[PDB]
PDB file of C-alpha atoms in Angstrom:
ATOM      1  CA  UNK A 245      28.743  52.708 166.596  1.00 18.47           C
ATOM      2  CA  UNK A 246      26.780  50.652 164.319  1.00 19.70           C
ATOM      3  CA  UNK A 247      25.443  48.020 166.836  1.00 19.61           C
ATOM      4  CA  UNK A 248      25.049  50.700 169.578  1.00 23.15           C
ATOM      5  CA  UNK A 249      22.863  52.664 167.104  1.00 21.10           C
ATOM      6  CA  UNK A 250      21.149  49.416 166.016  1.00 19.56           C
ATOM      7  CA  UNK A 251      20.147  48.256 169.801  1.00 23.24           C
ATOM      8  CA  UNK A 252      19.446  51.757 170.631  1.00 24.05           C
ATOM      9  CA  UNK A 253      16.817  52.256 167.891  1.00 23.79           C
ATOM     10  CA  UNK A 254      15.517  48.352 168.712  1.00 21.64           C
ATOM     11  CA  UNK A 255      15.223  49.415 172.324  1.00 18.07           C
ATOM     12  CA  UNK A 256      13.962  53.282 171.863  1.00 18.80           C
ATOM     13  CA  UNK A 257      11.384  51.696 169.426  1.00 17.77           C
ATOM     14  CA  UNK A 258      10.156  48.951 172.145  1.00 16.52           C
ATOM     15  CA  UNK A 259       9.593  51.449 174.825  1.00 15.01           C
ATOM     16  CA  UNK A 260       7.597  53.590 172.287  1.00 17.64           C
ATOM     17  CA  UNK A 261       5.364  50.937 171.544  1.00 16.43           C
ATOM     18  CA  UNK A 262       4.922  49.794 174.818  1.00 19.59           C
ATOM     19  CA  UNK A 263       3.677  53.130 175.872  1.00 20.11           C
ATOM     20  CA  UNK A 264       1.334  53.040 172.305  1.00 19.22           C
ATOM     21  CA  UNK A 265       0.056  49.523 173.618  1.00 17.04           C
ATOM     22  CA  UNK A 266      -0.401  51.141 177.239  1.00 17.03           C
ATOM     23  CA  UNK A 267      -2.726  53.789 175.438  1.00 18.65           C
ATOM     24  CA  UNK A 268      -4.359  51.747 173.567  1.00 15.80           C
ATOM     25  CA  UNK A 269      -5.388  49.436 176.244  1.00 16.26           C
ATOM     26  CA  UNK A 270      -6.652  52.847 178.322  1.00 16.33           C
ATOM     27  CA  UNK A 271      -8.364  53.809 175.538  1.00 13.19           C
ATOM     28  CA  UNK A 272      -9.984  50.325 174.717  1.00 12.66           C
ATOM     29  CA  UNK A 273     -11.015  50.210 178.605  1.00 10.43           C
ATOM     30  CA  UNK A 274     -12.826  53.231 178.636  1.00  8.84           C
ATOM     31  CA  UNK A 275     -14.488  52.860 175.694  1.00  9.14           C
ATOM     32  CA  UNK A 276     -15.844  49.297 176.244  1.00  8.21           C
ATOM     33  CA  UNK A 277     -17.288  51.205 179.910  1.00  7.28           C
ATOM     34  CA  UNK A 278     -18.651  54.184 177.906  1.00  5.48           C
ATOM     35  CA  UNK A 279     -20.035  52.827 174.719  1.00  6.12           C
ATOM     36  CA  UNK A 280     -20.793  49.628 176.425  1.00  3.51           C
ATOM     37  CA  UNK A 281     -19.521  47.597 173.023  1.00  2.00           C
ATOM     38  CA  UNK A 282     -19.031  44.348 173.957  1.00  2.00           C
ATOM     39  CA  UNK A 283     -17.049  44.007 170.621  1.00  2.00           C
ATOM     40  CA  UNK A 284     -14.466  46.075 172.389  1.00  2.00           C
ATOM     41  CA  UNK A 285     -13.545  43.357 175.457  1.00  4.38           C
ATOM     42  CA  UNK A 286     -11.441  41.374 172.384  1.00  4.19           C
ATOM     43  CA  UNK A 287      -9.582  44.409 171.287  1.00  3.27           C
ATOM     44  CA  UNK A 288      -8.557  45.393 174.930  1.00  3.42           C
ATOM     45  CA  UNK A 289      -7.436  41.729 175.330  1.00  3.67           C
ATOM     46  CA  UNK A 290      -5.848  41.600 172.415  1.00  3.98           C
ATOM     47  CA  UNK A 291      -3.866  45.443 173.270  1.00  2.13           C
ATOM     48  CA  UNK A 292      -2.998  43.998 176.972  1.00  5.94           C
ATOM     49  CA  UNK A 293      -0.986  41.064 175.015  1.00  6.51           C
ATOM     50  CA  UNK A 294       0.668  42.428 172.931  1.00  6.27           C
ATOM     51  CA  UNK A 295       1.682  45.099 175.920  1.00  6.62           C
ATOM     52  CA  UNK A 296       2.691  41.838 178.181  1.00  6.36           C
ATOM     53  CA  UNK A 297       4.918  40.148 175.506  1.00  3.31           C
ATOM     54  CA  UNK A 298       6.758  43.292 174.186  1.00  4.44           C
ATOM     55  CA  UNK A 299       7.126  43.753 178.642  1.00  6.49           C
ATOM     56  CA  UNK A 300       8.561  39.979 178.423  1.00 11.13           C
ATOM     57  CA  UNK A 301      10.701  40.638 174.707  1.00 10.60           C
ATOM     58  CA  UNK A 302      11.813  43.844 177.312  1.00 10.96           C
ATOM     59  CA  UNK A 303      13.171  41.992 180.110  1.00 12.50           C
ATOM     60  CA  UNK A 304      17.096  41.946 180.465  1.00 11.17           C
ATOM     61  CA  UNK A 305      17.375  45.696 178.884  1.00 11.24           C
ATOM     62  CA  UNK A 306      17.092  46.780 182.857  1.00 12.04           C
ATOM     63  CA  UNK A 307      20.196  45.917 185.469  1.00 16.86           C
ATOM     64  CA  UNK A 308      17.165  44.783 188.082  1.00 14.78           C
ATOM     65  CA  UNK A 309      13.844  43.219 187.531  1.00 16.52           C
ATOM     66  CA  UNK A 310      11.895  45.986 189.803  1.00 15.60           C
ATOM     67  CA  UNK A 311      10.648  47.800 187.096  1.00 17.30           C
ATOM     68  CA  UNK A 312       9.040  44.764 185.005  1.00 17.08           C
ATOM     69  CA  UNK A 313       7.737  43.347 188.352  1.00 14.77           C
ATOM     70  CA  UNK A 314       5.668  46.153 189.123  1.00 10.37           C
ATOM     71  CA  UNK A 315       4.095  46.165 185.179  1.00 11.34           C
ATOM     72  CA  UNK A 316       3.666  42.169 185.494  1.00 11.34           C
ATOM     73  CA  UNK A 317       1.982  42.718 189.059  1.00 15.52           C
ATOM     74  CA  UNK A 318      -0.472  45.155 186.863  1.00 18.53           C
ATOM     75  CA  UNK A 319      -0.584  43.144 184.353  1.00 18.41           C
ATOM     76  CA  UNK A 320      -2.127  40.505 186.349  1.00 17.14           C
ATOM     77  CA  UNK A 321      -4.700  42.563 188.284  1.00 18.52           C
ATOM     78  CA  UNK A 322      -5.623  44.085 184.911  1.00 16.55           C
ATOM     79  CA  UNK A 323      -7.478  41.156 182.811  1.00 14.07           C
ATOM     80  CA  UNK A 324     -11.438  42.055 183.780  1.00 13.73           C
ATOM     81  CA  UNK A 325     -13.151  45.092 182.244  1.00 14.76           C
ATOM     82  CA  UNK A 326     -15.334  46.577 184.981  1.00 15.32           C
ATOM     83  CA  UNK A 327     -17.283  49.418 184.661  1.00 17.85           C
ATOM     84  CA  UNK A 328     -19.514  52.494 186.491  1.00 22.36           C
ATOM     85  CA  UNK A 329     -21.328  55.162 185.302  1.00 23.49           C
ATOM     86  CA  UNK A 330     -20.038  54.891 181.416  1.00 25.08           C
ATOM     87  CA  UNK A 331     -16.772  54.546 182.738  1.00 26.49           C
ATOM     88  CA  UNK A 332     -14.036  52.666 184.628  1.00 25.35           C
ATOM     89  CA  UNK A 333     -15.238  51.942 188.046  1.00 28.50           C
ATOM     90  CA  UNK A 334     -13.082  53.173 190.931  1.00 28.76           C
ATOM     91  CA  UNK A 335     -10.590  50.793 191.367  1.00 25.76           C
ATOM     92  CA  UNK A 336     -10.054  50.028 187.632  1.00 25.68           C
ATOM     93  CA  UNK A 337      -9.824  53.758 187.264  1.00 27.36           C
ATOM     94  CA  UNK A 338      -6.892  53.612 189.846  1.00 27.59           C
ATOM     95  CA  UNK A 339      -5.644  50.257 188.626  1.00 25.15           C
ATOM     96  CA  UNK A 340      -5.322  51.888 185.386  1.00 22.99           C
ATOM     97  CA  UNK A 341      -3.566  55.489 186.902  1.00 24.42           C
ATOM     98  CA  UNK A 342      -0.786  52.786 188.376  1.00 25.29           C
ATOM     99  CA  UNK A 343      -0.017  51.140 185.445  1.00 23.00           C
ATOM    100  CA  UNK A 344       0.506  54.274 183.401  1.00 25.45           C
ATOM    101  CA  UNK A 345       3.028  55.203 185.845  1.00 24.96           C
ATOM    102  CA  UNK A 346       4.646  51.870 186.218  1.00 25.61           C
ATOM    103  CA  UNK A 347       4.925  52.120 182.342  1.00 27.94           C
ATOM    104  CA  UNK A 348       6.504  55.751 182.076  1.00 29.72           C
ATOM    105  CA  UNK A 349       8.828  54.795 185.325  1.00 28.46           C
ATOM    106  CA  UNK A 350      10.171  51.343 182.770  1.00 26.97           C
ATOM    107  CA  UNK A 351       9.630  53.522 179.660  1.00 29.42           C
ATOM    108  CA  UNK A 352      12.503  56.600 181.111  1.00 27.65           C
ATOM    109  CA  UNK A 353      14.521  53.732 182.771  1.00 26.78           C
ATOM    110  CA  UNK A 354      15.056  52.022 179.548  1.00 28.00           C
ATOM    111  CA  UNK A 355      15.868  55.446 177.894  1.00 29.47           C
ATOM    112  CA  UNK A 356      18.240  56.097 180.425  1.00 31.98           C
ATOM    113  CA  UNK A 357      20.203  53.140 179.835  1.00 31.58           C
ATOM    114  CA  UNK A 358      20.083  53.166 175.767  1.00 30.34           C
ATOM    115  CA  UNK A 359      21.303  56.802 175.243  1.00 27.52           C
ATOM    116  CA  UNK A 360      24.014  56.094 177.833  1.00 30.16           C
ATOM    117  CA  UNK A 361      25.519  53.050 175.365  1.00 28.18           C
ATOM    118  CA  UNK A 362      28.875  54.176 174.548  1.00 26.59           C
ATOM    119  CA  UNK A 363      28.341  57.648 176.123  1.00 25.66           C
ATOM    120  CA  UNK A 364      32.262  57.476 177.937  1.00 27.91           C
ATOM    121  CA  UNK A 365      33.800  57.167 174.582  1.00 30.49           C
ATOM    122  CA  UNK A 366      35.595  59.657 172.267  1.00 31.22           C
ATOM    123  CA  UNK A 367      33.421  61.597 170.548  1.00 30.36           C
TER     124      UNK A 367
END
């Protein structure tokens, strides 16, 4: 009970701020496009690492590596900051709509498998 609670809250927690680190890197994006700060292209950078190694800290919590492949594949397509009209140009834009949902599918798989920990056993 008191190491399924402890890698529970470990894992819960990681998911969490995976999906905080997700936001922030959205919000960084669009805000470097709309305010056009070029002091902002560091703090995205520095939001899409931390993102990549809590996704690499992440790896093994999953039986199968489909999950973290799709976020890597993201990942990788996700390093330039490119803009139109004061905001994300049209493929970022989309780029950006798939990796939310490739973080939300990883984010409710991990769940999944955490609250299940020791689920068969008397209560």
């Amino acid at each position: 009970a008191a190491l399924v609670n402890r890698t529970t809250l470990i894992d819960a927690r990681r998911s969490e701020a995976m999906t905080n680190a997700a936001l922030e890197m959205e919000r960084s994006y669009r805000q470097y496009c709309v305010l056009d700060d070029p002091t902002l292209a560091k703090v995205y950078q520095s939001q899409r690492k931390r993102y990549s190694e809590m996704l690499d800290a992440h790896a093994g919590v999953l039986p199968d590596d489909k999950l973290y492949q799709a976020l890597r594949q993201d990942l990788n397509n996700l390093a330039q900051l490119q803009c139109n009209n004061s905001g994300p140009d049209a493929a970022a834009a989309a780029r950006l709509e798939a990796f939310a949902s490739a973080n939300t599918e990883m984010v409710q798989a991990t769940r999944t498998v955490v609250f299940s920990r020791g689920q068969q056993l008397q209560r």
